[PDB]
Each structure stands twice: as C-alpha cells, then as structure tokens.
Write an enzyme that holds these catalytic residues in place. Structure first.
Site, PDB file in Angstrom:
ATOM      1  CG  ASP A   1      -4.156  11.452   8.665  1.00 17.19           C
ATOM      2  OD1 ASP A   1      -5.224  11.971   8.293  1.00 17.19           O
ATOM      3  OD2 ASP A   1      -3.342  10.920   7.905  1.00 17.19           O
TER       4      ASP A   1
ATOM      5  N   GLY B   1       0.810  -1.215   0.000  1.00 18.74           N
ATOM      6  CA  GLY B   1       0.000   0.000   0.000  1.00 18.74           C
ATOM      7  C   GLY B   1       0.845   1.268   0.000  1.00 18.74           C
TER       8      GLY B   1
ATOM      9  N   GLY C   1       2.543   9.820  11.293  1.00 11.24           N
ATOM     10  CA  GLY C   1       3.343  10.793  10.563  1.00 11.24           C
ATOM     11  C   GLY C   1       2.969  12.247  10.857  1.00 11.24           C
TER      12      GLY C   1
ATOM     13  CB  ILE D   1       5.375   2.766  -0.700  1.00 16.58           C
ATOM     14  CG1 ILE D   1       6.852   2.374  -0.632  1.00 16.58           C
ATOM     15  CG2 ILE D   1       5.121   3.831  -1.765  1.00 16.58           C
ATOM     16  CD1 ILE D   1       7.253   1.307  -1.651  1.00 16.58           C
TER      17      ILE D   1
ATOM     18  CD  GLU E   1       1.780  -5.725  15.664  1.00 16.59           C
ATOM     19  OE1 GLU E   1       1.736  -4.557  16.165  1.00 16.59           O
ATOM     20  OE2 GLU E   1       1.109  -6.691  16.067  1.00 16.59           O
ATOM     21  CG  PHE E   2       2.377  -8.074   7.922  1.00 12.17           C
ATOM     22  CD1 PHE E   2       1.755  -7.089   7.171  1.00 12.17           C
ATOM     23  CD2 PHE E   2       2.151  -9.397   7.591  1.00 12.17           C
ATOM     24  CE1 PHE E   2       0.892  -7.425   6.135  1.00 12.17           C
ATOM     25  CE2 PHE E   2       1.305  -9.728   6.546  1.00 12.17           C
ATOM     26  CZ  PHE E   2       0.669  -8.740   5.826  1.00 12.17           C
ATOM     27  CG  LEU E   3      -1.377  -4.241  12.355  1.00 12.14           C
ATOM     28  CD1 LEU E   3      -2.297  -4.932  13.339  1.00 12.14           C
ATOM     29  CD2 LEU E   3       0.041  -4.355  12.826  1.00 12.14           C
TER      30      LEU E   3
HETATM   31  C1  LIG Z   1      -2.458  -2.780   4.144  1.00  8.98           C
HETATM   32  N1  LIG Z   1      -1.544  -3.093   5.210  1.00  8.98           N
HETATM   33  C2  LIG Z   1      -0.723  -2.185   5.722  1.00  8.98           C
HETATM   34  O1  LIG Z   1      -0.559  -1.095   5.148  1.00  8.98           O
HETATM   35  C3  LIG Z   1       0.041  -2.540   6.942  1.00  8.98           C
HETATM   36  C4  LIG Z   1       0.175  -3.801   7.559  1.00  8.98           C
HETATM   37  N2  LIG Z   1       0.936  -3.737   8.655  1.00  8.98           N
HETATM   38  N3  LIG Z   1       1.313  -2.428   8.757  1.00  8.98           N
HETATM   39  C5  LIG Z   1       2.089  -1.909   9.758  1.00  8.98           C
HETATM   40  C6  LIG Z   1       2.368  -0.590   9.741  1.00  8.98           C
HETATM   41  C7  LIG Z   1       1.882   0.232   8.718  1.00  8.98           C
HETATM   42  C8  LIG Z   1       2.178   1.643   8.756  1.00  8.98           C
HETATM   43  N4  LIG Z   1       2.435   2.764   8.770  1.00  8.98           N
HETATM   44  C9  LIG Z   1       1.056  -0.285   7.711  1.00  8.98           C
HETATM   45  C10 LIG Z   1       0.773  -1.659   7.738  1.00  8.98           C
END
Ligand SMILES: CNC(=O)c1cnn2ccc(C#N)cc12
Length: 293
Positions: free
Chosen positions: A142, A30, A162, A36, A98-100
């Site tokens: 935001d 994204g 940000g 990005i 972290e990956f969400l």
């Molecule tokens: C569509 N997913 C994401 O964009 C996403 C997934 N984990 N993640 C962690 C931090 C940030 C920021 N800043 C974004 C994201």
C-alpha cells in the site's frame, strides 16, 4: 461467533494488558481503511505516542490484522515507524507506536509543490526501507503518500503495513487483490502472481502524486481507473515539462508495465536522481506548521 473466536486468536499474539492504564488525552488525528489514529500522552513522562485502533468487526479481511504484529515483532528499521506494543482492547486491536509529528506526505502533496531535492529525499528514504523489506520477502502493497510519515525534523518513515504480505522459496509470489486502486501495479490488477516489484510501481505513482498533486485517473471511479491502469501504457506526468531529465529517467525505471524489466529497490538506490536528495531538514518547510510561519 467467528468474532469471539477471532478476538481469542488475536489475544494469543498481542501484549497482555491495557494501555489506557498509562495513557491520557486520546485525540483523533486521522483514519485509514482499517481504523483510526489517536495521539495519546504517556502520563508518567508527558511523552506523546500514536495509537492505531482497528475494530475487528469492520475489516474486509480481518486476518490481515496479524500483519501489524508480524512487522512489529520482526521488521523494525530506521525508515519504518517504531511499533512499541499491541493489545486487544474490547473489540479493537490497538497498536501503540511512535508519534510522527511531521504528519503524512499526503498533506504536503495536496497543499504544496515539492522540488526535486525534496522528492529525491523522500524517494531515497522509501527505497532504503523497501530494499531491506524486499530482501526479507516483505511486500508493503500500500505505498502512497498517506503511507509516508515525517518526524518534526523531516525524517521519512513507512507506515500502514496492514496490507503487507510475505514471499519465500516456498511461496515465491502473492495473488491477492490488495492496495489502493490508483496506486495498484498493472500485473496485480491483472491477477498475475506478483512480488515486491508491485511496491516499485506504487512508488512511481507516488512520484506522480509529488509532481502533479494527485495520482493518474484520480477523477475516475476506482473500478474504472484499475481498468485503465491494466489496459493503457504507463501513465504520463500532467507536468512533464516541469521535471529534470534525471527525474524522468528515474520515473521511467519505476512505471514499467513488465515487472521483470522494472528496477528493484536495490538498483534504484544507485540511480543518479537520488544524488539530488536533500537532508531531512530540506523537507521541514513543507509541513503545515512551517509553511504558514
Ligand atoms: C497524521 N499522523 C498520523 O496519522 C501518525 C503520526 N504518527 N503515526 C504513527 C503511526 C501511524 C500509523 N499507522 C500513524 C501516525
């Protein structure tokens, strides 16, 4: 060059080194206003992480990039995305986080119809995050569906700091024109000095996203929508007739023009609407990978 100068400044606050050393398979998932977002694999473990990459030359106000490392160092919490490290990589700030995997609330409000149990769960989670941030003088500035991320198992976390700012005894209010037009508080569009109350207004607009599928005046160009927000009475749900009196009562505490009469996060945590909040599991069916299943 102010650029070279700014790079040097960023280096003073970030971790040393280069995460390309330990990550594989960067894939873009994204983009925000500041850069990005890629997913990456930690080579040693096969763990996934998220990397936000923000070009120093492509910011409206490049000094706002410091906000990422202020939140990372200071304001970690269970309803805030974990930030692991920050690096200067060439001309970019990279934040490894972290990956969400549940993705952003935006996809859900675009494609789905949340019920009130689900809306209450999101609102509760955001309000817990905001009560703690606001108590420390941190204003997110935001709040909108894109700023809300989900774990696979439906837990809710605030992201995209940000544009955040700090208030204190010595700086009790902010004045900057910051946010996303359709979600901006009327006092902020009016250029009144403001505080954390603006986040509560933006949350009210996010409730409208979650009920109506878009914020008010989303059809208007932004400069024109801000005019409308500033001048008109609080916006009304397109689908008033679809919401419980409980939810309407809740919303009416959020979308108050006068910041002094708007409910605070800490007050909103006790509101009866949030008793409806479902557990994280209640959110999981809304996610793209589950709704089709
Ligand atoms: C569509 N997913 C994401 O964009 C996403 C997934 N984990 N993640 C962690 C931090 C940030 C920021 N800043 C974004 C994201």
């Amino acid at each position: 060059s102010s650029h070279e100068q700014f790079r040097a400044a960023l280096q003073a606050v970030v971790d040393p080194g280069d995460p390309r050393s330990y990550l594989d398979n960067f894939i873009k998932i994204g983009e925000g206003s500041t850069g990005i977002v890629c997913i990456a694999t930690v080579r040693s473990s096969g763990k996934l992480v998220a990397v936000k990459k923000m070009d120093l030359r492509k910011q409206q106000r490049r000094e706002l990039l410091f906000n990422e490392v202020v939140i990372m160092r200071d304001y970690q919490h269970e309803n805030v995305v974990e930030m692991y490290n920050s690096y200067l990589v060439g001309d970019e700030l990279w934040v490894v986080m972290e990956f969400l995997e549940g993705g952003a609330l935006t996809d859900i409000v675009t494609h789905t119809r949340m019920n009130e149990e689900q809306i209450a769960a999101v609102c509760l989670a955001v309000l817990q995050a905001l009560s703690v941030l606001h108590a420390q003088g941190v204003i997110h500035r935001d709040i909108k569906s894109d700023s809300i991320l989900l774990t696979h198992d439906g837990r809710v976390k605030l992201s995209d700091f940000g544009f955040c700012a700090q208030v204190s005894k010595e700086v009790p209010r902010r004045k900057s024109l910051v946010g996303t037009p359709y979600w901006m508080a009327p006092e902020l569009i009016s250029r009144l000095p403001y505080g954390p109350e603006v986040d509560i207004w933006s949350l009210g607009i996010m409730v409208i996203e979650m009920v109506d599928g878009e914020p008010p005046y989303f059809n208007e160009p932004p400069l024109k929508a801000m005019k409308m927000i500033r001048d008109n009475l609080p916006p009304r749900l397109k689908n008033l007739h679809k919401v419980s009196p409980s939810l309407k009562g809740f919303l009416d505490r959020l979308l108050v023009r006068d910041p002094a009469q708007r409910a605070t996060a800490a007050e909103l945590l006790k509101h009866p609407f949030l008793a409806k909040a479902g557990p994280p599991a209640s959110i999981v069916p809304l996610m793209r990978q589950n709704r089709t299943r």
